[PDB]
Amino acid sequence: NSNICEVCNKWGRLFCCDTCPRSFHEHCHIPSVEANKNPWSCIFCRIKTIQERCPESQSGHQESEVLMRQMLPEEQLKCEFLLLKVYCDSKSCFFASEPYYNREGSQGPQKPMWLNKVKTSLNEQMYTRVEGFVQDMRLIFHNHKEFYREDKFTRLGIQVQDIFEKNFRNIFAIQETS
Ligand SMILES: [Zn+2]
Ligand SMILES: [Zn+2]
Ligand SMILES: [Zn+2]
Numbered sequence: 649n650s651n652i653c654e655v656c657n658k659w660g661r662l663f664c665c666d667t668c669p670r671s672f673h674e675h676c677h678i679p680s681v682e683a684n685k686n687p688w689s690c691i692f693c694r695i696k697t698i699q700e701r702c703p704e705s706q707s708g709h710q711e712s713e714v715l716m717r718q719m720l721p722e723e724q725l726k727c728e729f730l731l732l733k734v735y736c737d738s739k740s741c742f743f744a745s746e747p748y749y750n751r752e753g754s755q756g757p758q759k760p761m762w763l764n765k766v767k768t769s770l771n772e773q774m775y776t777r778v779e780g781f782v783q784d785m786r787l788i789f790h791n792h793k794e795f796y797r798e799d800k801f802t803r804l805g806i807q808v809q810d811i812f813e814k815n816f817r818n819i820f821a822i823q824e825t826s
Contacts, residue, residue, distance in 0.1 A: 665690035678732045691729050708823025715779035726819050727781045733815040739808050757791035
C-alpha cells in the first residue's frame with residue numbers, strides 16, 4: 649500500500665485498501681473510513697465493481713437523464729466519489745470551508761456553498777436526486793466567479809470547476825460530444 653493519503657498526498661494515520669494499493673486518512677475518504685469491515689475496499693474499488701458488474705453502465709448518457717436519477721445506493725456512491733475527486737485537487741482548499749464576503753465593489757452571493765457543506769449534505773442523505781448534488785457543486789464555482797469579478801483569483805473557480813466537470817462526465821459516463 650501507498651504511504652501517503654490518496655486525496656491530500658500527506659502521511660499520517662492511514663487506512664489501507666485491501667483490494668488496491670491506495671491509502672486514506674479517515675476523513676479524507678468519502679464516506680469516512682468504516683470502523684470495522686475486514687477486508688475493506690476503498691471507494692475507487694467500489695466504483696470499479698459497479699462498472700464490472702454492468703459494463704453497459706459505461707455507454708454514453710444524456711446529462712439531463714443523469715440529473716433526474718434518484719439517489720439510490722449506486723448514485724449516492726458515484727456522487728461521493730465525484731466529491732472525492734474534487735478534494736483530490738490541492739486547489740479545493742479554497743472551496744472547502746465556509747466562505748465570507750467583504751470586498752470593495754462586490755456583494756456576497758445569496759446562497760453560499762462550500763465542499764464541506766456538500767459533504768455533510770451527502771452524509772445526512774439530504775439529496776433525493778443527482779441534480780441536488782450537482783447544482784450545489786456548480787453553485788460553489790459560480791458564486792466564486794461572480795464575487796471575484798475581474799480579479800485574477802476568479803481563475804481558481806474555473807480551474808476547480810473544470811476538475812469537477814471532467815470527473816462528472818467520466819463517473820456518470822456522459823455521452824462524448826464535440
Ligand atoms: Zn488525507
Ligand atoms: Zn481500493
Ligand atoms: Zn449486466
